[PDB]
Design a binder for this molecule. Structure first.
Ligand SMILES: COc1cc(CN2[C@@H](c3ccnc(OC)c3)N[C@@H](c3ccnc(OC)c3)[C@@H]2c2ccnc(OC)c2)ccn1
Lengths: 300, 237
């Protein structure tokens, strides 16, 4: 039930699989990760011991093919690859499992954290944000810039997040300048939800993906995107009740999961203070307000 | 970036620019009600939009009718200011549109940027200068035109009169800011200094008296003295 074998581990590396991580030593006999839950996207990520300016990884869904990791000594990284030969793959995995050279995806049965962080995240949507159509998996790293950051510089290596800009013709109807700037409902509901995302699930999917790229890779542009998608909802007087309730759950699990010592660089004081205390939705995010007040009261 | 004492000469170069001051847009008298509560009564206001190079003052009169049935009037006043400035720019031929608009209060930046989205090449700038444009309503003719208005109006004044026939924009702006700083600090004293000698009149279409160059020197000196006279009181220095 869903394995990502490794050819080898020639270089010492911290390997992450979703919210879990473990250290592998140079030439440690490590041949990958087994028992990966079917039904969710996953991210396998890497931070070399020799150079922490090298934080990168792959979004994938084991339903879409047989994936493996192999170090490339030329490009100096762990690369995801697809094995098209089902039986070579089954034979590799069976062997490595028998010799117990794999770590087990260490899911606690009671623990819905990964589901809660990826509920609306779809591999098909990831592959539109991260364009490399010849692979079924998506490479992301710490340095990758967003299309929006590239406006304000290689398009093939960019994060194609939906551009959100509060001081844009897209966000502001002529003759409704003050109305649309102070109450962003038009921009959220008509431009973004009805126009671009089609539904709240796709919007939440991009929000959740942006957060995860921010947390796992310290990707700055992803953090800007996550905050902009929060702020657009919190600055809208008119939001479906189902969306506010789901947003509260999404943000609760994202704040819960965030490492305690990274709040300073991954949380924007202005957005959170505005969202929880000044905004239209200041009384709509009970779970988020409670975990933020108890976990990061300094930030607020 | 921000206009300051470092980049001051920029005001007098050949790039069209306007200062916008919104401090007289929303004006009220505070009074007691019969029941002993407090209420406001709006009075007419104005937008002070000045080309510091030519002295052209686009005085948009804000009639109290603007405010009827509106909430959060101090917030709306910033957006109405930005709406009227954007309407003024749109009304001008391309070659007369400003390249920059300098707002005297930082709270005007977002309202004006949002109203001017159609003009991405017009720079909206704040300033670190403490300009005394709030004292515009101490100029008798500006005050008169605002208080008499029965509907929205917009009257073009030359706030430098015919000074530019004799002095540079830099000097005219310095004279204007000294007069307004004086009027702001002690309006009574300032007005006494300007209107003391009845032989020196104000031309029909002028705002200030027809001082000779030598009489401007005495007036400017008396205005400085006043600002120091009043400063040694505010601070007991
Ligand atoms: C829209 O502008 C106006 C202007 C006025 C009328 N103003 C005046 C103005 C001055 C003083 N009191 C006023 O109390 C309403 C109005 N400003 C004028 C002016 C001055 C210099 N350059 C100027 O332009 C470069 C303009 C002009 C005027 C009117 C009558 N005679 C004038 O010249 C003999 C001049 C009336 C209505 N609308």
């Amino acid at each position: 039930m869903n394995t990502v074998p490794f050819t080898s581990a020639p270089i010492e590396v911290t390997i992450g699989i979703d919210q879990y991580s473990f250290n592998v030593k140079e030439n440690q006999p490590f041949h990958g990760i087994k028992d990966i839950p079917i039904g969710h996207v996953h991210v396998i990520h890497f931070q070399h011991a020799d150079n922490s300016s090298m934080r990168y990884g792959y979004w994938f869904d084991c339903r879409m093919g047989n994936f493996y990791i192999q170090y490339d000594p030329k490009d100096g990284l762990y690369k995801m690859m697809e094995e098209r030969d089902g039986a070579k793959f089954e034979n590799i995995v069976h062997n490595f499992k028998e010799r117990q050279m794999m770590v087990s995806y260490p899911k606690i049965d009671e623990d819905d954290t990964w589901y809660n962080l990826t509920e609306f995240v779809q591999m098909d949507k990831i592959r539109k944000i991260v364009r490399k159509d010849e692979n079924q998996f998506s490479y992301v790293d710490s340095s990758m810039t967003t299309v929006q950051e590239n406006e304000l510089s290689d398009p093939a290596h960019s994060l194609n997040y939906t551009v959100i800009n509060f001081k844009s013709r897209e966000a502001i109807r002529p003759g409704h300048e003050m109305e649309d700037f102070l109450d962003k409902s038009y921009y959220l509901n008509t431009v973004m939800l009805q126009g671009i995302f089609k539904n709240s699930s796709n919007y939440f999917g991009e929000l959740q993906f942006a957060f995860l790229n921010a947390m796992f890779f310290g990707n700055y542009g992803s953090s800007l995107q996550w905050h902009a998608m929060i702020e657009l909802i919190c600055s809208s007087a008119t939001v479906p009740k189902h969306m506010l309730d789901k947003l509260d759950e999404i943000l609760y699990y994202q704040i819960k999961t965030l490492p305690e010592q990274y709040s300073d660089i991954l949380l924007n004081e202005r957005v959170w203070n505005i969202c929880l205390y000044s905004s239209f939705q200041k009384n709509s995010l009970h779970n988020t307000e409670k975990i933020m007040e108890n976990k990061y009261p300094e930030l607020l | 970036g921000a206009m300051n004492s470092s980049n001051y000469a920029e005001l007098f170069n050949n790039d069209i620019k306007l200062f916008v001051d919104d401090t007289n847009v929303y004006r009220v008298t505070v009074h007691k009600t019969f029941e002993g509560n407090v209420a406001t009564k709006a009075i007419n206001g104005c937008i002070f939009t000045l080309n510091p190079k030519t002295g052209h003052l686009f005085l948009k009169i804000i009639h109290t009718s603007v405010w009827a049935g509106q909430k959060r009037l101090s917030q709306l006043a910033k957006w109405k200011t930005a709406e009227e400035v954007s309407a003024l720019v749109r009304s001008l031929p391309k070659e007369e549109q400003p390249k920059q608009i300098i707002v005297t209060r930082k709270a005007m930046l977002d309202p004006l940027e949002v109203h001017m989205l159609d003009f991405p090449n017009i720079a909206i700038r704040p300033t670190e200068l403490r300009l005394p444009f709030s004292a515009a309503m101490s100029i008798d003719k500006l005050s008169d035109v605002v208080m008499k208005a029965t509907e929205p109006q917009m009257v073009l004044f030359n706030i430098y009169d015919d000074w530019l026939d004799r002095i540079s924009s830099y000097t005219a702006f310095s004279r204007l800011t000294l007069l307004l700083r004086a009027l702001k600090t002690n309006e009574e004293s300032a007005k006494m200094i300007l209107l003391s000698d009845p032989t020196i009149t104000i031309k029909s279409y002028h705002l200030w008296p027809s001082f000779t160059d030598e009489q401007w020197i005495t007036i400017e000196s008396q205005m400085r003295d006043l600002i120091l006279t009043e400063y040694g009181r505010k601070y007991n220095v």
